[PDB]
Structures are given as structure tokens and as C-alpha cells.
């Protein structure tokens, strides 16, 4: 039929390791575009980015855009994305760390409002203030606040946390409750950690403190970051009351951009591997409230780093380094996932779309020529006429630094 979520019994897919190039990427996108957001749900999509002039690092931001639209067969049985509703804040320097979750007629995007820059780097001068922007996927004229609505959040229950903030590209709905990926700032003095639990076992230059010390942006940060969720329950009416849910401490690493999604009827979670646990952290969710993930013991997918915590490092070290390169579960019984990784050890480059299980990469294909620099990747997978497809956004330097979008059909067979 049309486009829908990855639910039910999809068309079968190749489950054997194969170095034949059987993945056929199809580009669908055609001074700097950064801070991207992609999210795909129920034939609809949310997208965001920030356009800066000059750098990508420094540099004045000319325009922040947050859009929603439809994902449809573009004509050749290949899906692409068609914008239908776009919002622009007046001041593009005040909107940060947006994340989008879909419910029925809208896409709700939760953002941080900042006049001190990125709250991660100015964490103690940032006064926590959050907003929602609600965008209709199928807008209609002269409909007041239906197409676009802006709400300032006034009531936040942070538990034991000083400040909380959305942290990640996308979240999920359960019933009429929305859960966004988030992060809590906690004073380092109030942080409870037993260094006995830091896995230093066969690590020559690790010290048991390295876990605690790496729970913030540096060893003497005032705050540690713990990932989690922000719950917004729509059946409550009144004004918006946001609640924070901290993540369980199994395989605990620094708060980082993460993503929660539904696949084959169950919620999956991915957390970016900044710090020392450089192997990919993702898995099914045992419980939502409180948040617990059963992380895969994945031995083949990691992320690029720098001197102390490079790709494939498993030893605890004091570092804040890495990239958000997520993956999407496409087959639960064999735990197969699709995602884009940067095939290099210490430099952010060489995107590679791979389909992999915990211990082996079944198949893969690059998305550029070698040494092309890359950064954040976001992948989301869905069904088109019951065939499993994935769309992936990849930050790329060409010559403009911008997000490219690819559609990748996952094959039913392994013959080249």
C-alpha cells in the first residue's frame, strides 16, 4: 500500500554475512547546515536544522527551521520526504537540542531556550527553560493554532535533578503519553557512585575513579549528565506538566544524545557512546518508567574518537569524545539492526551503511568516497508495500557542510 511503521510481519530479509554489494543506496535530498534532527513515524516525518554563516563551529546562525511533512512513494517505488509545514523562530540563536515525537495529527518538538549558548557548555549559567512547538502534518488554512502552536513549559518535575533538557533526535508515544530523550544535570557533589563498579579489570592505565570522573564534560565539571526521558501526558489537560525519568545505571555512561523508538511492537533505545564505552549502546527497553535498557553486547560497531577514547576502546578513561551514529532494529528474533557508522578510528569520516547483528556485520556499503568527513547520523526504518526501507540523514562535508538524506532498501536475498 503506502508507507507505514515497521510493524507486523515484514517481507523477509537476508540474514547471512555477504560481502557482495547488495545494498543499493538512493540519494533523495539534492554557508553551513548543522544540528540536524530527523524522525519518521506513520508515513510522516519531522526534520530540523540550523543554518549558520561561515563556520560550523563558530559563526552566527542565520536561520533555525523545524518542519514536518509526508513520506511517500516518489514515483519509482522509492520513498522520499515532502515538506508540508515549516516553522522558524525569530532568534535562531535561542533554540537548542530539539527533539520530535509524533502523536496522531501533530509532531510535538521539545526544545531548550537559551541566551548563553549551548547549555551543555554553559551548564551553570543556563536557566532551565523549555518549549514545545506543535506542527500539524496535514495543515489547513485559517485554522488558528492548528498548523503551528508554541507553548512555554512552566511545570517541570526533575526529581533530584537541578536542570533537565531534551537530548536526542526523537521519542515515542505510549497511548496519549509522549516520552522525549532527555538529560538531567546533577551536582557532582550529590552524585552517588561506587568506584568498585568501574570495570577496570584488565586495563593497565585505568583507575577506578575514571568512571565517576567521566560522568561530566570534564573531571572537574560542576555537573554530571545522566540520560533519561521527559514524559508529557496529553490526557492531563491543564497546562503542560513535564516529568523526568532517570535511566538505570547498568552500563551507565555520560548523559548523551539518545533516541527511543518503536519497532515490531516494542520500544528500543539507543544512546550515543561519548566517554570510554566506545562500543555501541542500544537495546530493547525492559521498562519505560523507570527507564531500563537491556543493552546488546555488540562487539562489531563502535564510533570514532580522539587520543584517549578512540574507536573500539573498552577501558575506562577520563574523556568526553564521540559522535551520534544511531541504528534501528529491523528484526527482533535475530536482533538485526540498520545504521550508519563512521569507518575510522580517530577522525570523523567514511560513512558506511551497515546491517548487523551483535557479533557480525551481515552486509554494508559506503555512502561516499573515502576521506569525506562526516558527523551525526540518524537512521529510521519503516515499511513500503511491506518492504523494509530505511532513510538515513548523514552530516557531510563536500563544497558545503550539510545533511544528505539516503533511502536504502534492505534486500530479501543475498544473491548479488
Amino acid at each position: 500500500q503506502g508507507v507505514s511503521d515497521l510493524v507486523g510481519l515484514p517481507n523477509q530479509i537476508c540474514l547471512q554475512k555477504t560481502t557482495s554489494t547488495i545494498l543499493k543506496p538512493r540519494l533523495i535530498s539534492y554557508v553551513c547546515i548543522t544540528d540536524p534532527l530527523l524522525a519518521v513515524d506513520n508515513g510522516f516525518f519531522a526534520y530540523s536544522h540550523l543554518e549558520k554563516i561561515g563556520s560550523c563551529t563558530r559563526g552566527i546562525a542565520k536561520q533555525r527551521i523545524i518542519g514536518v511533512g509526508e513520506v511517500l512513494d516518489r514515483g519509482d517505488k522509492v520513498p522520499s520526504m515532502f515538506m508540508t509545514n515549516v516553522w522558524t523562530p525569530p532568534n535562531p540563536s535561542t533554540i537548542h537540542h530539539c527533539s520530535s515525537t509524533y502523536h496522531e495529527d501533530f509532531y510535538y518538538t521539545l526544545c531548550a531556550v537559551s541566551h548563553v549558548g549551548d547549555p551543555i557548555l554553559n551548564s551553570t549559567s543556563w536557566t532551565e527553560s523549555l518549549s514545545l512547538i506543535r506542527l500539524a502534518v496535514r495543515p489547513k488554512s485559517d485554522s488558528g493554532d492548528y498548523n503551528q502552536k508554541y507553548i512555554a513549559i512552566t511545570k517541570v518535575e526533575r526529581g533530584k535533578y537541578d536542570k533537565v533538557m531534551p537530548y536526542g533526535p526523537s521519542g515515542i508515544k505510549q497511548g496519549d503519553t509522549l516520552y522525549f530523550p532527555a538529560v538531567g544535570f546533577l551536582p557532582r557533589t550529590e552524585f552517588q557512585y561506587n568506584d568498585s563498579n568501574c570495570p577496570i579489570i584488565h586495563c593497565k592505565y585505568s583507575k577506578a575513579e575514571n568512571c565517576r570522573l567521566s560522568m561530566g564534560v570534564n573531571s572537574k565539571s560542576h555537573y554530571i549528565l545522566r540520560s533519561g526521558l521527559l514524559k508529557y501526558n496529553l490526557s492531563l489537560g491543564g497546562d503542560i506538566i513535564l516529568q523526568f525519568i532517570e535511566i538505570a545505571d547498568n552500563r551507565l555512561t555520560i548523559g548523551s544524545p539518545s533516541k527511543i523508538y518503536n519497532s515490531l511492537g516494542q520500544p528500543v533505545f539507543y544512546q550515543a557512546s561519548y566517554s570510554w564505552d566506545t562500543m555501541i549502546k542500544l537495546g530493547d527497553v525492559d521498562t519505560v518508567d523507570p527507564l531500563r535498557v537491556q543493552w546488546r553486547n555488540n562487539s562489531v560497531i563502535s564510533r570514532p574518537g580522539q587520543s584517549q577514547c578512540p574507536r573500539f576502546n573498552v577501558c575506562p578513561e577520563v574523556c568526553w569524545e564521540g559522535t551520534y551514529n544511531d541504528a534501528f532494529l529491523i528484526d527482533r528474533l535475530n536482533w538485526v539492526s540498520a545504521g550508519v557508522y563512521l569507518n575510522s578510528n580517530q577522525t570523523a569520516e567514511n560513512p558506511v551503511f551497515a546491517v548487523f547483528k551483535d557479533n557480525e556485520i551481515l552486509y554494508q556499503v559506503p555512502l561516499a568516497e573515502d576521506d569525506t568527513n562526516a558527523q551525526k547520523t540518524i537512521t529510521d526504518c519503516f515499511l513500503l508495500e511491506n518492504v523494509i526501507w530505511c532513510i538515513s540523514l548523514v552530516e557531510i562535508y563536500d563544497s558545503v557542510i550539510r545533511p544528505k538524506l539516503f533511502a536504502v532498501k534492505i534486500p530479501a536475498q543475498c544473491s548479488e
Partner: antibody
Amino acid sequence: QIQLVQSGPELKKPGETVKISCTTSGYTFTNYGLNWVKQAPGKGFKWMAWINTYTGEPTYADDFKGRFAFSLETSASTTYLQINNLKNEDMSTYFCARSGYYDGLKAMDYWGQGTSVTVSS
Amino acid sequence: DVLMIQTPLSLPVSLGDQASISCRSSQSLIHINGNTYLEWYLQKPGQSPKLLIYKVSNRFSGVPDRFSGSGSGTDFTLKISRVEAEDLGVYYCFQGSHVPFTFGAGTKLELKR
């Protein structure tokens, strides 16, 4: 001539404190860590702790916390297992064994001869 | 903790026959750095244990080619291809992937009669 050499057998009363020694030679002390293993009479083996010879920090099992102390003297190129507050269920043979880091081989290639701890009043 | 089931626990052999020990695991032993740390040791009465095999299939310095280690995931097997007198003894498998590290019960390789 890589060798591990442990202190001699011990006779201790219940409640007393014993300190077993294991001295290494024939290789640079800090390029390998060291495991401690317990063998109960006529029974199998049980892993106790693994100590990092560079940092001095042990990683011990939960069953051996509190009244078990795994230390080392880097100068003497030796490691120690101390047991405080000795009880019958500690009467056993204790081996030290070489176990390298992730940089090399972490299997136990060379073992000490064992130390026997006997507990009787 | 990860349990290690060695079967069998007694292995009667005739000198020159072939023997094989199955060590099976409660949780997978594939470390997230890709190494499977399953080792086989042999202890003789009154002696230290001796390292036979490491990383599932790799023999240690000085081990006869008769000793071969196989397996993956949670099922591993030690194989002795012809049995010699200096083989008889107690065989222990050992996982080094998850803390605390654990051994098997041990298999007694004894002489048949």
C-alpha cells in the same frame, strides 16, 4: 626462568589472620597483573581477585570482600593476599598466577606452587 | 555469575583412544571487544594447574598438537586426539569474559579397565 614463588604452608587458629606472599621473577613485574585462586580440598577452583601491577588496584569478586585484602609491594616485585578473621571455611590451597592485560595475554600461563592454609585450634 | 557446565565429570579412556570434554556456558562469552576468553587448564595431583588452551582454540607454548579446542558462543569442546599416560589428570574450563570469573566442576581423565 619466569617463576612465581609463594610463602610456605600455614597453620592458624580460627579468628587469626594470615598473609600469603607470592613473589615473581624472570620478567618485568608491571607488564602483567596477577590472579589469586582458591582450591578447596578435593574440590574445584574459584577465582578471587585480579590485581593490576601498574596501578596496584585489585578487582575482586563479591564473595571475597571485606576480610580479604589483595595488595602488592612493587619494590619486592611481590603480591600479598591477607585474610583477617579466619574461619574453617577458609582452609584451602591458594595459588597466584600470572595474567596479562588486554595488551597481551590475559590467560594464566605461569602459576605459583600453591600455599596451604590449615585452620585448627 | 556465569555457570560453567563441564560434562562429563569422569572420562574413562583406554591409552591411545580419543577423548572430548564439553564445556557449556550460562551466558554468552563473546566480550564486547570481540574476543571469547574461554581457556582450558590441566591439573595433575600435587602440581600446579597448567595452561593448555586460550581464546577457545589457541594452544599455549609447549602443548602437544593432540589437544585442540573448538566452539563458539556458549558451547565449547576440548579434544584429545590420542590419550597418553601424561595426559591423565583433571581438566578445567574457565571463562574470563564476565566478572566474577568462573571455572567448571572439572573432568577427571582416568584410565579404563
